[PDB]
Design a protein around this ligand. Structure first.
Ligand SMILES: *[C@@H]1O[C@H](CO)[C@@H](O)[C@H](O)[C@H]1NC(C)=O
Lengths: 126, 105, 49, 84
């Protein structure tokens, strides 16, 4: 069962440090691409920043340099997003995403898509 | 890149063939995605690369593309088709979504 | 002394050994279990001989 | 030059029994040389093209195989005919 276990809801104050959970289970994590899209509550969506969890290759948008730092430990196979100073502008419902594969899913399965299956969703009120 | 959706409210009855316009600015020809979301649920893929149907959705839904212009067309409406849809281009980074439309009675 | 060798050197002390009149048995390295990885770039690993 | 037109979704073979006959279309997705579900795995390799990524840039090539076999003509050039 290809599943991506997201953590729960949270209410915090700005300035604290935070680590959220995105546990992928029931598939091959090292073979899939990991796309990232954030959804503000009740309004449009903005790309918050993407990482390559295969080797922790960080590639954030110019407007999101250093604001979010994603990590993923292959031991427990869960993707973490770190914060160094919480901001009120990022209170939203976050969605961490795997890759969908439609043409030879077992060929490489990497850099294929950015929406395969999501858990209950971690609404991260930053 | 701004994505425009029309109309904001699309009053349709059962069986009504209605179309919404999702127009882009520049060349995103090859890779373009479409999603469907239910109230309180996660968006599910509808059409990827603007020409391929995604599994899990009834085949009655279909998306069209014409250069920089794209239109989501439902030929045979179903009683459950009253919902909200969005756009997504993935030809060039970054990826931007559409606006969305609410369907009232 | 290189394939089934016992001891090797460090990175900054890489010394060249010009061995002459050799016979390149590569099947042992291709099927070796003592060596966990056999990642080969220049030519095909099956046609090393 | 398809650089502007045409991303890791292109495969090419590395291991095979022998060369394929002219215009052969073979499709197989397993049975690597040495190292079914073992280290020996999928034999094709995904090209390294990416929307974020001269010789390493993606192109596209097409071939127009022209068959000159003696047969009733179907595809003809834009030549205007005259009275015989
Ligand atoms: C190298 O050592 C292994 C382990 O004993 C042995 O199986 C192999 O035959 C040796 N290589 C040669 C060329 O004999």
């Amino acid at each position: 069962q290809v599943q991506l276990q997201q953590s729960g809801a949270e209410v915090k104050k700005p300035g604290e440090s935070l680590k959220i959970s995105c546990k992928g289970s029931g598939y091959s994590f090292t073979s899939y691409w990991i796309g990232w899209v954030r959804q503000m509550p009740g309004k449009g969506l903005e790309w918050m920043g993407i990482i390559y969890p295969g080797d922790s290759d960080t590639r954030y948008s110019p407007s999101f340099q250093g604001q979010v730092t994603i990590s993923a430990d292959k031991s427990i196979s869960t993707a973490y997003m770190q914060w160094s100073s919480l901001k009120a502008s990022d209170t939203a419902m976050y969605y961490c995403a795997r890759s969908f594969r439609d043409d030879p899913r077992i060929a490489v399965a990497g850099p294929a898509d950015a929406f395969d299956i999501w858990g209950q969703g971690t609404m991260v009120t930053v | 890149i701004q994505m425009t959706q029309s109309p904001s409210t699309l009053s349709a009855s059962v069986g009504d063939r209605v179309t919404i316009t999702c127009r882009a600015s520049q060349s995103i020809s090859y890779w373009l995605a479409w999603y469907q979301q239910k109230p309180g649920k996660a968006p599910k893929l509808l059409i990827y690369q603007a020409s391929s149907l995604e599994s899990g959705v009834p085949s009655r839904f279909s998306g069209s593309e014409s250069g920089t212009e794209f239109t989501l067309t439902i030929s045979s409406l179903q009683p459950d088709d009253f919902a909200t849809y969005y756009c997504q281009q993935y030809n060039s980074y970054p990826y931007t979504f559409g606006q969305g439309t609410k369907l009232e009675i | 002394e290189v394939f089934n060798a016992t001891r090797f050197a460090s990175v900054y002390a890489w010394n060249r050994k010009r061995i002459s009149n050799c016979v390149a048995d590569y099947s042992v390295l291709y099927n070796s279990a003592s060596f966990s990885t056999f990642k080969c770039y220049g030519v095909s690993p099956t046609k090393l001989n | 030059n398809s650089n502007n037109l045409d991303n890791y979704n292109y495969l090419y073979r590395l291991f095979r029994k022998s060369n394929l006959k002219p215009f052969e279309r073979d499709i197989s997705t397993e049975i690597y040389q040495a190292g079914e579900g073992f280290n020996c795995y999928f034999p094709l390799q995904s090209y390294g093209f990416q929307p974020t990524n001269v010789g390493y840039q993606p192109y596209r090539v097409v071939v127009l195989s022209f068959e000159l076999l003696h047969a009733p003509a179907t595809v003809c050039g834009p030549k205007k005919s005259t009275n015989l």
